[PDB]
Coordinates of C-alpha atoms and ligand atoms in Angstrom, one line a residue:
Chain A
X1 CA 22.8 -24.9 6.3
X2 CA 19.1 -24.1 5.1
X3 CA 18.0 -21.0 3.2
X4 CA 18.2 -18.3 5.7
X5 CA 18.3 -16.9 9.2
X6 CA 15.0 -15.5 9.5
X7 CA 13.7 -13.7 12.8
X8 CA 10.1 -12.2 13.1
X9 CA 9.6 -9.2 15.7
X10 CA 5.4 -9.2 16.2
X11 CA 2.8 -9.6 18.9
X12 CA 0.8 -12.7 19.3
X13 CA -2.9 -11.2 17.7
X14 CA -1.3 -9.3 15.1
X15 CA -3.0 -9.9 11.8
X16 CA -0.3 -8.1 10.1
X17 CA 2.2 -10.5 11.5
X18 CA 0.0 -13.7 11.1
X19 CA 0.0 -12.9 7.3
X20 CA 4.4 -13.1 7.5
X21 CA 3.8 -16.1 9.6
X22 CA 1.4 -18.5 7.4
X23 CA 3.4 -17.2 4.8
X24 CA 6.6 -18.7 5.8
X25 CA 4.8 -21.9 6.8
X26 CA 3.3 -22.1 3.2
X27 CA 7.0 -22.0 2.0
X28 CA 8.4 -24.1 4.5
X29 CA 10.8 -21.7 5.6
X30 CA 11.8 -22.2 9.5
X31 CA 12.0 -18.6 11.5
X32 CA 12.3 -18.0 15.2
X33 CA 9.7 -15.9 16.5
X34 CA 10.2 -13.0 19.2
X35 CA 7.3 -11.8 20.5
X36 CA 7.5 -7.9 21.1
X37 CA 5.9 -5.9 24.3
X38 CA 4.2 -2.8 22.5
X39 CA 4.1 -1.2 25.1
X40 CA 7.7 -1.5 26.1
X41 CA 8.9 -1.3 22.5
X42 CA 12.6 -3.3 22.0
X43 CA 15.6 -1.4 21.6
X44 CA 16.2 -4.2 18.2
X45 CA 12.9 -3.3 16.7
X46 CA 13.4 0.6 17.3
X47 CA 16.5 0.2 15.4
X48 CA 15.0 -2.1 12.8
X49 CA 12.1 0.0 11.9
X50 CA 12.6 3.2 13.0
X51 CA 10.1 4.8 10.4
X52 CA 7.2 3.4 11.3
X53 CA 8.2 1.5 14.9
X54 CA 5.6 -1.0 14.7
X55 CA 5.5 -5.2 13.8
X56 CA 6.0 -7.1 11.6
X57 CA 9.5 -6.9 11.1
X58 CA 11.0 -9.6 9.0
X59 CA 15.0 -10.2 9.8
X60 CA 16.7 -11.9 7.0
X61 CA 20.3 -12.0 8.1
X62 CA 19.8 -9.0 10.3
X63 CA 18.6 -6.9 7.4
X64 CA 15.0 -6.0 8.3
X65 CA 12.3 -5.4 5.7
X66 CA 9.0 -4.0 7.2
X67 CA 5.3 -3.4 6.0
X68 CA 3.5 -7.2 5.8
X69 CA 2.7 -6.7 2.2
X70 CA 6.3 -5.6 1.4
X71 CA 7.5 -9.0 3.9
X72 CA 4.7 -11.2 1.7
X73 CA 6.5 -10.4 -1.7
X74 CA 10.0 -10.2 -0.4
X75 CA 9.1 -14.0 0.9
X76 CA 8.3 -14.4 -3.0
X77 CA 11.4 -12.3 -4.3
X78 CA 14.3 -13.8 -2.2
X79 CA 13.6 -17.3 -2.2
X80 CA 12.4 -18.3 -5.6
X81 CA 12.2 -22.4 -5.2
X82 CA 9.6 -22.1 -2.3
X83 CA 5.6 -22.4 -3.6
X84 CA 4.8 -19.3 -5.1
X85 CA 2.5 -16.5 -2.9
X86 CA 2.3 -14.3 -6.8
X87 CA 2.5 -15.8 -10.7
X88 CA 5.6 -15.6 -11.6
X89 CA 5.7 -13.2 -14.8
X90 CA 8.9 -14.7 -15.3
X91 CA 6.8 -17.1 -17.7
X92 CA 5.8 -14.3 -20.0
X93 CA 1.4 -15.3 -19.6
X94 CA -1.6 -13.4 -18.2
X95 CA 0.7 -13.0 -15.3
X96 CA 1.7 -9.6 -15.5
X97 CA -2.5 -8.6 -15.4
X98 CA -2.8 -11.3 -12.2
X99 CA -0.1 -9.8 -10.0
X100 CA -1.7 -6.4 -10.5
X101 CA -5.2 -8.1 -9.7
X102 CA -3.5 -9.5 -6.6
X103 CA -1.6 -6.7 -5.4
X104 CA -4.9 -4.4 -6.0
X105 CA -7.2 -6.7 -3.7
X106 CA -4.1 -7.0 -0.8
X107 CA -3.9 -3.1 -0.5
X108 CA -7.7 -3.1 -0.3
X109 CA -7.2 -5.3 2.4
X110 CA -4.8 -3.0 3.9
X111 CA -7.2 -0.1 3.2
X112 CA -10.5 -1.6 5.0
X113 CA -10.2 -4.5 7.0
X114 CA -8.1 -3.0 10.2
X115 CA -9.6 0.2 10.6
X116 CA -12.7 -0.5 9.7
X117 CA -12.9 -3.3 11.6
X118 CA -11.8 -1.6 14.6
X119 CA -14.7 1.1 14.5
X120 CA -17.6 -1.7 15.7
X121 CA -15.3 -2.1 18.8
X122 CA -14.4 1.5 19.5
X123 CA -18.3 3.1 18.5
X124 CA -21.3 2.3 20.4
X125 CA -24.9 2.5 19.5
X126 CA -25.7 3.7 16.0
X127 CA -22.9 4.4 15.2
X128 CA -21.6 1.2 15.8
X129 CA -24.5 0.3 13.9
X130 CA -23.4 2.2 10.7
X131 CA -19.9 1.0 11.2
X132 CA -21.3 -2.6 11.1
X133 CA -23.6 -1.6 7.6
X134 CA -19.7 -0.7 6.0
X135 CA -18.2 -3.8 7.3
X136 CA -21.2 -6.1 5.6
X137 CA -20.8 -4.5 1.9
X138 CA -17.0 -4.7 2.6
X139 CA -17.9 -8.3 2.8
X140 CA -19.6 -8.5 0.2
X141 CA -17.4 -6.9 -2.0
X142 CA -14.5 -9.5 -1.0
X143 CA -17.1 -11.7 -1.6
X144 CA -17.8 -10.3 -5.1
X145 CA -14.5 -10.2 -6.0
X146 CA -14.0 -14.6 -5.2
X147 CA -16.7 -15.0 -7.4
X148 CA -17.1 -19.0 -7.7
X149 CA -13.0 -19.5 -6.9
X150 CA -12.3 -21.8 -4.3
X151 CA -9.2 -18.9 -3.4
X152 CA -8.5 -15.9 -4.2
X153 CA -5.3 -16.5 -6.4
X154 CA -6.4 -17.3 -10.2
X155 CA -5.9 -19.8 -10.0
X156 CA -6.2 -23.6 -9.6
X157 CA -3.6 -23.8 -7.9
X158 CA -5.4 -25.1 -5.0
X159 CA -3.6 -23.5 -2.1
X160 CA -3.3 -20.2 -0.4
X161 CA -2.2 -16.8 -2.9
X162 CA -0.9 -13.2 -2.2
X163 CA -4.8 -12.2 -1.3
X164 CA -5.4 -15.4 0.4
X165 CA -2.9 -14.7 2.6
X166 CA -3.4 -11.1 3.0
X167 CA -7.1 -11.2 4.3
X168 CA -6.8 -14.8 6.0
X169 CA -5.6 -13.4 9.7
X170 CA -9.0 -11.4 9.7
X171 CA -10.9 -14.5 9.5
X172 CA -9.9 -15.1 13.3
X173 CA -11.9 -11.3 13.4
X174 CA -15.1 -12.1 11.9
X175 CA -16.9 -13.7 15.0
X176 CA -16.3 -10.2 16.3
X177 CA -17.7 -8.4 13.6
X178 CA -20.3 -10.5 13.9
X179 CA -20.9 -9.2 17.7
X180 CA -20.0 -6.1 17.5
X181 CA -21.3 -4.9 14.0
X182 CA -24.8 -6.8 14.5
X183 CA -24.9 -9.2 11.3
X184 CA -23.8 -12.9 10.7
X185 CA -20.7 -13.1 8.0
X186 CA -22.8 -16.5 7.0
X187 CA -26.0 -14.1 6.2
X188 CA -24.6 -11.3 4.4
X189 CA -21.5 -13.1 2.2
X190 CA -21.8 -16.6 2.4
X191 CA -18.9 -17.9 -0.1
X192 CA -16.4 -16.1 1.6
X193 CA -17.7 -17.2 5.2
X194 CA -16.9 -21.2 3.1
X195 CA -14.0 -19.3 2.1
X196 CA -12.7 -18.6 5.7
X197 CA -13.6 -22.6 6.5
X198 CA -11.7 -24.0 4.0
X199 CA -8.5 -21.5 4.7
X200 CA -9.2 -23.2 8.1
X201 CA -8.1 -26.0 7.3
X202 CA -5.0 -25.3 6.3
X203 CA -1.9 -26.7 8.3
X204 CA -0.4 -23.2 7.8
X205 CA -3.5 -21.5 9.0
X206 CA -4.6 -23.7 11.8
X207 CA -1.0 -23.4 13.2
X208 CA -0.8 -19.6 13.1
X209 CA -4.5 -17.7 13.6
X210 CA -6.0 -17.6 17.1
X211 CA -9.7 -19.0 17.6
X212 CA -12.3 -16.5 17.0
X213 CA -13.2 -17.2 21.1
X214 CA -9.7 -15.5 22.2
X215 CA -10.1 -12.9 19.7
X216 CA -13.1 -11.5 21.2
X217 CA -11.5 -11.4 24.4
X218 CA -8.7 -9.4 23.0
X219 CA -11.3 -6.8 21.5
X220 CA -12.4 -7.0 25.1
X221 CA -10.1 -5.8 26.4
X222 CA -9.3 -3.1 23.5
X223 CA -13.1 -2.2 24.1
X224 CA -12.2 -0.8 27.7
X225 CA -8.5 0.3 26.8
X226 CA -9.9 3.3 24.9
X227 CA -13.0 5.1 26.4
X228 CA -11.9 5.0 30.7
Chain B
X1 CA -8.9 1.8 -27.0
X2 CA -7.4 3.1 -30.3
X3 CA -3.9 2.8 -28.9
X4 CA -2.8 0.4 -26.6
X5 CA -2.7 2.3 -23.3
X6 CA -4.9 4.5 -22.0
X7 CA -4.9 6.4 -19.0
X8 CA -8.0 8.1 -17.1
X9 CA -6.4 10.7 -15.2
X10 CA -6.6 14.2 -14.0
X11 CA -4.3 17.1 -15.1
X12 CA -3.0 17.9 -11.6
X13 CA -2.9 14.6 -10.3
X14 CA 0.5 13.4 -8.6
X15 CA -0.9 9.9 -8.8
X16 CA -1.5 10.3 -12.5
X17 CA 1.6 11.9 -13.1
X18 CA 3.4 9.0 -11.6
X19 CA 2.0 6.8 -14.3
X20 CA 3.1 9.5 -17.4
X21 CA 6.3 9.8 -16.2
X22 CA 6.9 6.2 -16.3
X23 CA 5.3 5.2 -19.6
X24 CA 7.8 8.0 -20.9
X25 CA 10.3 6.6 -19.3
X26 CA 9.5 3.3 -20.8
X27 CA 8.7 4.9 -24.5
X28 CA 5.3 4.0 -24.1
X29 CA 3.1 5.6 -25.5
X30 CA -0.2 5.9 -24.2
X31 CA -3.9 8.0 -24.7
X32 CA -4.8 10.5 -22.0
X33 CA -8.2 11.0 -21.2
X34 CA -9.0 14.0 -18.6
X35 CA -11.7 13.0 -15.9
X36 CA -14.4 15.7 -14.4
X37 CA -14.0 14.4 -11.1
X38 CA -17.3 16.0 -10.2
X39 CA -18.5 14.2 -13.1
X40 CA -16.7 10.8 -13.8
X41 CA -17.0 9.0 -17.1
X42 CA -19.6 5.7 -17.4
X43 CA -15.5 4.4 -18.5
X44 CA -13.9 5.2 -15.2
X45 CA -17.1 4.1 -13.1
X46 CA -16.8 0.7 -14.7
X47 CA -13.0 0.2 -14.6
X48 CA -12.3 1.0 -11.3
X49 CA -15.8 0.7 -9.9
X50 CA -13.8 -0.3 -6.1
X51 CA -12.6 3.2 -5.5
X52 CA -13.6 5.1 -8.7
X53 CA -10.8 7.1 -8.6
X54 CA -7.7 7.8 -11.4
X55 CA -5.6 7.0 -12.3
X56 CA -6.8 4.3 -14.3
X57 CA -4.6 2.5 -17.1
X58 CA -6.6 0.6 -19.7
X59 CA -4.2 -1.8 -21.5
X60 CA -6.2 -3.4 -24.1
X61 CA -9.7 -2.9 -22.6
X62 CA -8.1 -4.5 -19.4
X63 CA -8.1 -2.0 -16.0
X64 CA -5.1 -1.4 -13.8
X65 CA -5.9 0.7 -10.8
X66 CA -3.8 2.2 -7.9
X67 CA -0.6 4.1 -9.0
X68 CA 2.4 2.5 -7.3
X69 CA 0.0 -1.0 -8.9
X70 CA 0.3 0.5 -12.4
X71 CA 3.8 1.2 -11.9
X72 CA 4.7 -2.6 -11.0
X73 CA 2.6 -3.5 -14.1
X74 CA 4.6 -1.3 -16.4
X75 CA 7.4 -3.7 -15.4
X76 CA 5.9 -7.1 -15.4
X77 CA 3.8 -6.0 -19.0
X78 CA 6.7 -4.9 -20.3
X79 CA 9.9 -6.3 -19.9
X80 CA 11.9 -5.1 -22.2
X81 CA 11.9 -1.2 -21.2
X82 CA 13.9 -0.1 -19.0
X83 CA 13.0 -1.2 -15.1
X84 CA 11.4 0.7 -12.2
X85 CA 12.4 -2.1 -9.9
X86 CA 15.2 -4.4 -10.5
X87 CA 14.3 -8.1 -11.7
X88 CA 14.4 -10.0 -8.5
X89 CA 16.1 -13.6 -10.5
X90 CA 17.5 -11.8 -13.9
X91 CA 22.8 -7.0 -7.7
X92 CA 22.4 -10.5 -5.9
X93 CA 20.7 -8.0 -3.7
X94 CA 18.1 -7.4 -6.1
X95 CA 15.0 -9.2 -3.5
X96 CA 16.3 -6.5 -0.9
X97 CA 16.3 -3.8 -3.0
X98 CA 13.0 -4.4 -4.0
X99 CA 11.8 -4.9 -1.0
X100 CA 13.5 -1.2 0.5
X101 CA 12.1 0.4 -2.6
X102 CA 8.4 -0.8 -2.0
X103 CA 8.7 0.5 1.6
X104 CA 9.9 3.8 0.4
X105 CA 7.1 4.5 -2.4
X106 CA 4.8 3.0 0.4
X107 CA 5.8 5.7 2.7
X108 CA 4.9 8.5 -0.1
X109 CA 1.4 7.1 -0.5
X110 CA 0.8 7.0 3.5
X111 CA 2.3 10.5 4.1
X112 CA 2.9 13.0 1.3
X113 CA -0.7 13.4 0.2
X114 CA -2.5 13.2 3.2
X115 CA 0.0 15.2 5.3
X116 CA 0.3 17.7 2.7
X117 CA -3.9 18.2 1.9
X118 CA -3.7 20.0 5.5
X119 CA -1.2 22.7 4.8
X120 CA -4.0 24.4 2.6
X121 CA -6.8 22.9 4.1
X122 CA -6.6 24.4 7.7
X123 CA -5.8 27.9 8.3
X124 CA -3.7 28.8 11.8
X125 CA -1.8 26.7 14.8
X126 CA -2.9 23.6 13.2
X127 CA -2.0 24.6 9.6
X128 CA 2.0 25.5 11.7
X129 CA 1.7 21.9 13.1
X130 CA 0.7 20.1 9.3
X131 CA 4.0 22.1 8.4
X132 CA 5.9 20.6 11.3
X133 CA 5.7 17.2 10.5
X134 CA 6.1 17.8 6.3
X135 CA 9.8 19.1 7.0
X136 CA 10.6 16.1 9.0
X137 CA 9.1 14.0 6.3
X138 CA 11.1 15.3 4.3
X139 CA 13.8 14.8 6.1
X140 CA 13.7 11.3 6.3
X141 CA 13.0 10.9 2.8
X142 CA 17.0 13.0 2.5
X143 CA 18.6 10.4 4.9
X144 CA 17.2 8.0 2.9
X145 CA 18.6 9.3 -0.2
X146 CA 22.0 10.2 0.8
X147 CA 24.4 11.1 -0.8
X148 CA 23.3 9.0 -3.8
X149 CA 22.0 10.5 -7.3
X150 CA 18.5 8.9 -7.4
X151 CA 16.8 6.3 -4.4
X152 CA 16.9 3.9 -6.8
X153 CA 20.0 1.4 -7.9
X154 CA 22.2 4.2 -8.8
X155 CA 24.7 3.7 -11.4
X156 CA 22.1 3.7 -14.8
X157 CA 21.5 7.5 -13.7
X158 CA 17.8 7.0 -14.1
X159 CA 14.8 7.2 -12.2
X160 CA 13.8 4.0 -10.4
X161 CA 10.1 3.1 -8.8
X162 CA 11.1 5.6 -5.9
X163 CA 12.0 8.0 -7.8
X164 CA 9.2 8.3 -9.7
X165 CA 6.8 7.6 -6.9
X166 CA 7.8 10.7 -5.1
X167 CA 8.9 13.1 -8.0
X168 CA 5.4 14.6 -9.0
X169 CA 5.3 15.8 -5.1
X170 CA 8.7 18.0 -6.0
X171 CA 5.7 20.6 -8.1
X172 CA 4.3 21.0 -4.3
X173 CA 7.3 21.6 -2.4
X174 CA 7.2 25.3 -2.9
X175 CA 3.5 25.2 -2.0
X176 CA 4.4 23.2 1.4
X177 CA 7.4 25.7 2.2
X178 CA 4.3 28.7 1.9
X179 CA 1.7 26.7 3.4
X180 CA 3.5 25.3 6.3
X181 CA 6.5 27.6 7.0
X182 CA 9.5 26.1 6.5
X183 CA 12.2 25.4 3.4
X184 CA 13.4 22.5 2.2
X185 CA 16.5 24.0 1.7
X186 CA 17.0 24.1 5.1
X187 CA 15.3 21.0 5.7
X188 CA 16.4 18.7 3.3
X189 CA 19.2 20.3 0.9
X190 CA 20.2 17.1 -0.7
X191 CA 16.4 16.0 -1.6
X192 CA 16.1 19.9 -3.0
X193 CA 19.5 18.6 -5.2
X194 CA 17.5 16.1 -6.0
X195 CA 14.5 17.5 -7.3
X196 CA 16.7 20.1 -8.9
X197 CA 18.2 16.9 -11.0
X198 CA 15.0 14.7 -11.3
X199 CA 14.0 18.3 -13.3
X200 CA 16.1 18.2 -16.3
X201 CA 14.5 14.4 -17.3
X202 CA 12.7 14.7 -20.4
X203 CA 9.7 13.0 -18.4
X204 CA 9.8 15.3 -15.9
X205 CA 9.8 18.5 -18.2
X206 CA 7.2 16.7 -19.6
X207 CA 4.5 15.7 -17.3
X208 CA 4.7 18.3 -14.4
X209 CA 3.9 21.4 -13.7
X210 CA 5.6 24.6 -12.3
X211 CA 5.7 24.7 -8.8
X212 CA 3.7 28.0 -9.4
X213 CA 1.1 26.7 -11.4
X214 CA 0.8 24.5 -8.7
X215 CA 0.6 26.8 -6.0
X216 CA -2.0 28.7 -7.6
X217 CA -4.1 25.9 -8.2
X218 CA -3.5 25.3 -4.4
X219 CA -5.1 29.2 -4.4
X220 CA -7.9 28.1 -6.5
X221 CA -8.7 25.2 -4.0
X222 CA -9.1 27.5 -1.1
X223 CA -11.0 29.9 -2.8
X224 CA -13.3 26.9 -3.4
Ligands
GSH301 N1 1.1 -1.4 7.7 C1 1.4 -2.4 8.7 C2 0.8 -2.2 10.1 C3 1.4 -3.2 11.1 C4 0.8 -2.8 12.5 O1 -0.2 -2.1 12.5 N2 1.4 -3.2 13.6 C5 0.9 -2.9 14.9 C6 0.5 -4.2 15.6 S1 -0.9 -5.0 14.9 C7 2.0 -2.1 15.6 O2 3.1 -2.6 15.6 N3 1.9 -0.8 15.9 C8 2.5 -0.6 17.3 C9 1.9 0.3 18.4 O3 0.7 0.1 18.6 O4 2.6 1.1 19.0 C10 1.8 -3.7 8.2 O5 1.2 -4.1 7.3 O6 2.6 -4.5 8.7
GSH302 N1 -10.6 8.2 2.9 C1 -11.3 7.5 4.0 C2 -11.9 6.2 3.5 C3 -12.5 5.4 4.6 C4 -13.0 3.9 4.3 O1 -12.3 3.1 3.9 N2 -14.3 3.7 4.7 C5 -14.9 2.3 4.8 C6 -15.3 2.1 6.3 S1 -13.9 2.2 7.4 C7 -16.0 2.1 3.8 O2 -16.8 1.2 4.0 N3 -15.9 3.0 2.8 C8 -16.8 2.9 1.7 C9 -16.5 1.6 0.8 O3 -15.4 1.0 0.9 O4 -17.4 1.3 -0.1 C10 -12.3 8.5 4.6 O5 -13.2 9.0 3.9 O6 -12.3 8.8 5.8
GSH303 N1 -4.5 5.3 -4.2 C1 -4.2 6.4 -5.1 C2 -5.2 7.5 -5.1 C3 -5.5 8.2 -6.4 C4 -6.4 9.4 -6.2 O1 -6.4 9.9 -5.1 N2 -7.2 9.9 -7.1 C5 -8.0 11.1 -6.9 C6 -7.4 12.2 -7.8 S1 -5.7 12.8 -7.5 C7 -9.3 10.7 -7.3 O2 -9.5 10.1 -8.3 N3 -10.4 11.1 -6.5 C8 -11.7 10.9 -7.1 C9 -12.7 11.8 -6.5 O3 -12.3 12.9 -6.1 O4 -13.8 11.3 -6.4 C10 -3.4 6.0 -6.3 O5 -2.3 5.9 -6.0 O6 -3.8 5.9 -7.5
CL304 CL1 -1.6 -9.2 25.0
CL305 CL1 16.7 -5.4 21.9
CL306 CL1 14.6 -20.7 -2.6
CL307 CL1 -20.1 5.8 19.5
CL308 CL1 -9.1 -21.2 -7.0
CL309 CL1 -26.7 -10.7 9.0
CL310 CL1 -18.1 8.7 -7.0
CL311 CL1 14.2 9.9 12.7
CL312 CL1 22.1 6.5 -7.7
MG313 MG1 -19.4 1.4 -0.7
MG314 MG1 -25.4 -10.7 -1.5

């Protein structure tokens, strides 16, 4: 007799499926993890999301709701007494202009860091090269975006926020940017390089992101699943 | 900034349209500005310097960008029209609702432009294939409608954040059906019914076009 029976379908390195993770941790909300073959998809998660087929699938009394961002503000929406990953505009204040701040910078999120990301380990040469030059200014324009903020969320608050949480699983990434894209995070956008430190830190975090070591490994072995 | 609200948009715009149909909705009314996309304003370049795309509201000086982001903002700036997505604390079900229609508006942004853009962009075998997978698109979107009146609540007989998210794409149906060889009659009768109801809403009369003024401007496109 807590709040909810909660089951998440994803795979290990998923930084879709880190975000649903961390985020739960944030709100102390207890889920049992299954961790899905991709490759030899479940018959539950077929049935679950049958749209798109792929993880994170939150269960929430075996109703599923897919799509990490969707899962991020459902966490938010169905359990109002747990720490907050949006303002509530159910206060008014400049909330209503913060959520669409928030929910702008997550689906940019969405929109870069994944695919982008995966050109420097799918390209070689120049091209990687060029790929690299896009992942630096998208750096720097998460960068520009934290401004002086010690998080993303606006703020004071003093723990993780919907963008917080949305870009923190890439963090575990950057080391292999940093390889494969030829340029130091540190170098290019050094307050979101302290940024990804201090989110490091976090119990949530710490509990639920990968090294940066076994990360690279992974894009090791996606670096040879593709071309042979 | 003489009124309120002002929206940077383009005529033809689905994403724009979104955003007219739902300040309507809402009795909001609002300034439209027309962008030359080919020559975007010093006001759009500033406001949404990210992407630089419209629509862009401007409430009070202050930017909103990204369409299903405006929509959510409409609700959460003002409260006291009538809602796009149910309030999550004031059925019981409201969190899951919510949660199904995000999914649903998300799955227009990630297929109906993009897998539409090819019927008139490619021309043969490919073009046949672009039309393919737009009827079963379509079809999903009619098994997740149902037998119901709108996607959203149902019971209020209005348009929810679904609803509105997917209704500007009901001017290009006809101009998928030529495109990509198929009807949605066939396809998807009870999303046709839909649109069929969707366009006797004062907002809908309003803000989009005839599915022929569409399709020629489809024609224009490939002339170009
Ligand atoms: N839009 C998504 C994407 C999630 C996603 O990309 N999941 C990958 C794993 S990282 C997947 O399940 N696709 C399955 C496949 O490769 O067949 C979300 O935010 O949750
Ligand atoms: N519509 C896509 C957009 C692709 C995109 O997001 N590009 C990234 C690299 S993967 C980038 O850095 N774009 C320019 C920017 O964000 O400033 C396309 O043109 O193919
Ligand atoms: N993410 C979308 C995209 C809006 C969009 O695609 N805008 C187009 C016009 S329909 C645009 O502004 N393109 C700018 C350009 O062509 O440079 C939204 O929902 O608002
Ligand atoms: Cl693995
Ligand atoms: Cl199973
Ligand atoms: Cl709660
Ligand atoms: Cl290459
Ligand atoms: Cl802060
Ligand atoms: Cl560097
Ligand atoms: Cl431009
Ligand atoms: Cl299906
Ligand atoms: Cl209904
Ligand atoms: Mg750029
Ligand atoms: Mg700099």
């Amino acid at each position: 007799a807590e709040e909810k029976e909660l089951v998440l379908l994803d795979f290990w390195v998923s930084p879709f499926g880190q975000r649903c993770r961390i985020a739960m941790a944030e709100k102390g909300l207890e889920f049992e993890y299954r961790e899905e073959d991709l490759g030899n998809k479940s018959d539950l998660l077929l049935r679950s999301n049958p749209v798109h087929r792929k993880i994170p699938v939150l269960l929430h009394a075996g109703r599923p709701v897919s799509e990490s961002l969707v899962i991020l503000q459902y966490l938010d929406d169905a359990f109002p007494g747990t720490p907050h990953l949006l303002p509530p505009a159910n206060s008014g204040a400049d909330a209503a202009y913060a959520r669409a701040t928030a929910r702008f910078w997550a689906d940019y999120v969405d929109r870069k860091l994944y695919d982008c990301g995966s050109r420097l380990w799918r390209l070689k040469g120049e091209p990687q090269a060029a790929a690299g030059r896009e992942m630096a200014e998208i750096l720097r324009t998460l960068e520009a975006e934290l401004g002086d903020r010690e998080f993303f969320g606006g703020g004071g608050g003093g723990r993780l926020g919907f963008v917080d949480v949305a870009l923190v699983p890439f963090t575990a990434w950057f080391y292999s940017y940093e390889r494969c894209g030829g340029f130091s995070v540190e170098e290019v956008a050094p307050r979101l390089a302290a940024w990804a430190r201090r989110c490091g830190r976090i119990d949530s975090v710490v509990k639920h992101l990968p090294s940066p070591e076994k990360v690279y490994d992974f894009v090791g072995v996606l670096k040879k699943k593709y071309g042979v």
